[PDB]
Amino acid sequence: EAFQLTPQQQHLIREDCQNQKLWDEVLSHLVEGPNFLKKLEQSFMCVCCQELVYQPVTTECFHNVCKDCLQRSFKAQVFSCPACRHDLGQNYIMIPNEILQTLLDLFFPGYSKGR
C-alpha cells in the first residue's frame, strides 16, 4: 500500500544529486500511499509563483525555483535566493535542472501545459 516508485523514477531520483537531501526527506512520505503525491507536490512548490516548479533552477543553496521566476527577481535587481535569501550574485548562471523537470513530468503528466 506504500506508494510504489517506478524504475524510471528511482533512476532519476538517484541521478538528481543537487536535490539529494530533499529527495531523502520527500521519500519519507512513500508510506502515506496515494497522499505521497500531495506531499511531493508541496516539496517542489515554487516560492515565487506558488505552483509546482516548472523549468526549475536548483540553486547552490539547495532551493528549486522556476527559471522564469528567478529571472523576474534578477530583473528587479534582487540577486538573492527567493526561498532563503542566500546571495547568488548578479552574474549567477541559471541552469535548469532537467533531471528534476523530467521527474515532475513523470509524477504529474501534463502539469506543464501553458506554463
67 in contact with Zn ion (CB under 5 A): no
Task: Compute the chain's Rg from CA coordinates.
Answer: 14
Residue nearer to Zn ion on the CB measure, 30 or 78:
78
Considering beta carbons, is residue 31 or 87 the nearer one to Zn ion?
A: 87
Whole-number Å distance between alpha carbons of 69 and 53: 9
How many residues interact with Zn ion (rule CB under 5 A)?
12
CB 13 within 8 A of CB 102: no
Site for Zn ion in 34-63 (CB under 5 A): 46, 48-49, 59, 61, 63
The C-alpha cell of 91 is what? 552574474
Please, what is the minimum distance in Å from the beta carbon of residue 50 to Zn ion? 7
Among 12, 40, 57, 69, binds Zn ion (CB under 5 A): 69
- Give contact residues for Zn ion (rule: CB under 5 A): 46, 48-49, 59, 61, 63, 66, 69, 81, 83-84, 86
